[PDB]
């Protein structure tokens, strides 16, 4: 699926009462994708 | 210009539009200034900054949202590296009830003012220990709908899942 704003994983189901994830905070840099017009 | 991305976990927001219980971290880069800001949000309420947590590049962050009911829950961001943790408890008066039908690990190009924030090159975010609880089940992202950001014809992310992880890679 593509969206304008969300990337990742969406479980669709029922009774989700807890979601957790752990990530290492990455270095961010300027984005080079995106439009120019 | 500012480039950000947010990585968050959340309940709802996809096929459940009424609420999102989410927490995560914004990574922003602006002209060398990188900032990481944890926040929680019980959409459609505003995101609130978790100002009481410092997030730095390289920190392992555990983000958890827990819905204690459709209208209550908590968002917790733990900085496992630094040992600092923040929780915010939503005790009702929430702006929307959860359906609890979506569980998600999301890297988001969030809105900033009248547009999506310029999407930071965050390299990759891998949510490990990516677990959603559905009743008694602990479910990983393997069966998740994989979403990627596409804007103005450009795919900005590649997302892959495994049994316990979601990797979103900036393209």
Swiss-Prot record, chain B:
Lineage: Eukaryota, Fungi, Dikarya, Ascomycota, Pezizomycotina
Bridged cysteine pairs (disulfide): 4-28, 16-99
Protein name: Aspergillopepsin-2 heavy chain
Organism: Aspergillus niger
Residue range from the parent sequence: 112 to 282 of 282
Coiled-coil intervals, chain numbering: none
């Amino acid at each position: 699926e593509y969206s304008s704003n969300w990337a990742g994983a969406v479980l669709i189901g029922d009774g989700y009462t807890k979601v957790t994830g752990e990530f290492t905070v990455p270095s961010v840099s300027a984005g080079s994708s995106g439009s120019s017009g | 210009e500012e480039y950000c991305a947010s990585a968050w976990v959340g309940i709802d927001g996809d096929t459940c539009e009424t609420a999102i219980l989410q927490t995560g971290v914004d990574f922003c880069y602006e002209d060398g200034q990188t900032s990481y800001d944890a926040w929680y949000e019980w959409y459609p309420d505003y995101a609130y900054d978790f100002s009481d947590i410092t997030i730095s590049e390289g920190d392992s962050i555990k983000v958890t949202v827990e819905a204690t009911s459709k209208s209550s829950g908590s968002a917790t961001v733990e900085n496992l590296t630094t040992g600092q943790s923040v929780t915010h408890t939503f005790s009702g008066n929430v702006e929307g009830d959860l359906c609890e039908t979506n569980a998600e690990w999301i890297v988001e190009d969030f809105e900033s003012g009248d547009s999506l924030v310029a999407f930071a090159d965050f390299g990759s975010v891998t949510f490990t220990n990516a677990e959603a609880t559905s009743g008694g089940s602990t479910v990983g992202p393997s069966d998740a709908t994989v979403m990627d950001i596409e804007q103005d014809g450009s795919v900005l992310t590649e997302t892959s899942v495994s049994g316990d992880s979601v990797t979103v890679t900036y393209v």
